[PDB]
Every structure is written in structure tokens, then in C-alpha cells.
From Swiss-Prot:
Native source species: Thermotoga maritima (strain ATCC 43589 / DSM 3109 / JCM 10099 / NBRC 100826 / MSB8)
Cofactor note: Binds 3 Zn(2+) ions.
Biological processes, Gene Ontology terms: base-excision repair
Family: Belongs to the AP endonuclease 2 family.
Binding site for Zn(2+) 3: 181, 228, 230
Protein name: Probable endonuclease 4
Catalyzed reactions per annotation: Endonucleolytic cleavage to 5'-phosphooligonucleotide end-products
UniProt keyword annotations, A-Z: DNA damage, DNA repair, Endonuclease, Hydrolase, Metal-binding, Nuclease, Zinc
Keyword Metal-binding (UniProt): yes
PANTHER family attached to this UniProt entry: APURINIC-APYRIMIDINIC ENDONUCLEASE, ENDONUCLEASE IV ENDODEOXYRIBONUCLEASE IV
Binding site for Zn(2+) 1: 69, 109, 144
């Protein structure tokens, strides 16, 4: 069964999210844990967490299909110690928001060394994840591949493995694959040989059960462009044919597809329709 959804707004409450998710034709979703402007975030009230949980039950959303995503402030690779410390403290709080909501997965970008060096930046990330994981329980942190922009770490799957193998609680570190960031970095899912190489690399670096989520994004730019600009499904350089190849892999189907393409609920309902249209047109099983 296809597990698909989108990044959902939380601005009207967490509890609106399950209903909004089924209204766009999804059964999966991603949300931010908060809308804080700075380094401090509130927890949801007991009242709000309870409503969220009730709506999850009401709509039969699978808890393996519900993800949180960290905000853009957190940078565990920062060469500024105070930003590193505030990032750690905020990440811990985001794990506590997840715990409160019942959310099992917290997705993050590993970070940027800002031109101080990839190897030292990886160590900083590792140490930061240790401080976080060693002071929390339950929640699994997802490392997401990113584009090769400035001092971003994680544009090659190899880098995500370097972080993971140094972490204390490796079972609480897993992986998210973003189709747009990968395409930006040369991972060519428009060809079955590219998808096969991607899967072989994932299986060998992490094992396939570490792949917890795919971010389903088309790209504004060509393969290898390193641009980090998402596009609506079928409207970019991955395209309808490219996605049809990607969708044809059973291994890919086992994993929730989360849209982070431009627009709101309305555009995402259309992108979800496009995905089923692509699957129908190209005769993909299932
Ligand atoms: Zn992301
Ligand atoms: Zn993403
Ligand atoms: Zn992106």
C-alpha cells in the first residue's frame, strides 16, 4: 500500500493535522514541532497533545507514518560553540515535543560547518547527537541527505554513515532520503540503474530498515546542479517518467512518501493525485 502525505501546517493546532492529511488524500505526514522564532520553544499543552492523539486514532493514521521535522536554526555542525549549545538544547526540546505528541521520528539536516571543515563538522554533529540521545528516550532521529551548498554536510550518503557509526545510540539514528537533494547531488532516480545503485548504497551503508521516510520532491534544476530548489511532482527535471521509475521499486514503496513541494494543502492534494496518476499511466504495480 502506498504511504503518502505531505509536510502539514500546524498553525491552527496539531490536532487539525490528521483531518487535513486525509482531506488531501494522504495517510502520512510531517510537521514542525513548533513555530518558535528563536532558541526556546514551548511544549504542546496536555490538552493539545491529547487532541492530536485522539484525531490520530480517529483517522487511523499509522504512527510509523507520522514525522516531525526540525526547524532551520539547529546546526549541530556549527563552529560557533554558543550556536552548537543552543542547537543541542533546542534539539532536546524538540525530542520532548515529539515524546509529548507520541511522534516517533524527528528529521534533521546534519548541519553546516560554514567552511571550517567537513571532518571536524561531522565530529561536532556526532557529539551533539550524543548529548541529545543520551539525555532523552524513545524518539529516533532521522538524518536527511542535503544539497552540496556552502558547508552542508550530508550531500553524500557516505557522510550520513560516518555520523551514524560514531554515535552512541545508533538504533535511535535512522535515515530520510530526499529525492530533490539526492538529484542535486548526482543520485539519478530517473534511471533504474540509478535507483538500484541508490538502494545498494543504502542497504550497504545503513541497511534498508534504516530508511524511514522519503521526501518526494521534484527539482527546479538538472541532475547534479546543487541548487536546493524543490518543484511540484512532474513539473521538474525528475519528471513524470523519472518518478515512475522510482515508484516501480518495491523497496521504495515500503517507505512513506512525504511531499515538500511548493504550495499549501491545496497544491499537495494535487501532487498526491499526480502521483496516483503517474502510477496509473505508467502501469506501476502496485
Ligand atoms: Zn529537510
Ligand atoms: Zn527534504
Ligand atoms: Zn530542500
Amino acid at each position: 500500500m502506498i504511504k503518502i502525505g505531505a509536510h502539514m501546517p500546524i498553525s491552527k493546532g496539531f490536532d487539525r493535522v490528521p483531518q487535513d492529511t486525509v482531506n488531501i488524500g494522504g495517510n502520512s505526514f510531517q510537521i514542525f514541532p513548533h513555530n518558535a522564532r528563536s532558541w526556546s520553544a514551548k511544549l504542546p499543552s496536555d490538552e493539545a497533545a491529547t487532541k492530536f492523539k485522539r484525531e490520530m486514532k480517529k483517522h487511523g493514521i499509522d504512527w510509523e507514518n507520522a514525522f516531525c521535522h526540525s526547524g532551520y536554526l539547529i546546526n549541530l555542525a556549527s563552529p560557533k560553540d554558543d550556536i552548537w549549545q543552543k542547537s543541542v538544547e533546542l534539539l532536546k526540546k524538540e525530542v520532548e515535543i515529539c515524546r509529548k505528541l507520541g511522534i516517533r521520528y524527528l528529521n534533521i539536516h546534519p548541519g553546516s560547518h560554514l567552511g571550517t571543515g567537513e571532518e571536524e563538522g561531522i565530529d561536532r554533529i556526532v557529539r551533539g547527537l550524543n548529548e541529545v540521545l543520551n539525555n532523552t528516550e524513545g524518539v529516533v532521529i532521522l538524518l536527511e541527505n542535503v544539497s552540496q551548498k556552502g558547508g552542508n554536510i550530508g550531500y553524500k550518503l557516505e557522510q550520513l554513515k560516518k555520523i551514524r557509526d560514531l554515535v552512541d545510540q545508533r538504533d535511535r539514528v535512522a535515515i530520510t532520503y530526499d529525492t530533490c537533494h539526492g538529484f542535486d547531488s548526482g543520485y539519478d532516480i530517473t534511471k533504474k540503474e540509478g535507483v538500484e545503485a541508490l538502494l545498494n548504497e543504502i542497504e550497504s551503508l545503513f541497511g534498508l530498515e534504516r530508511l524511514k521516510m522519503i521526501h518526494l520532491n521534484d527539482s527546479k534544476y538538472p541532475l547534479g546542479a546543487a541548487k536546493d530548489r524543490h518543484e511540484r511532482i512532474g513539473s521538474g527535471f525528475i519528471g513524470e517518467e523519472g518518478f515512475a521509475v522510482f515508484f516501480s521499486f518495491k523497496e521504495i514503496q515500503e517507505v512513506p512518501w512525504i511531499l515538500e513541494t511548493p504550495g499549501g494543502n491545496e497544491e499537495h492534494a494535487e501532487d498526491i493525485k499526480k502521483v496516483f496518476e503517474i502510477i496509473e499511466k505508467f502501469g506501476i504495480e502496485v
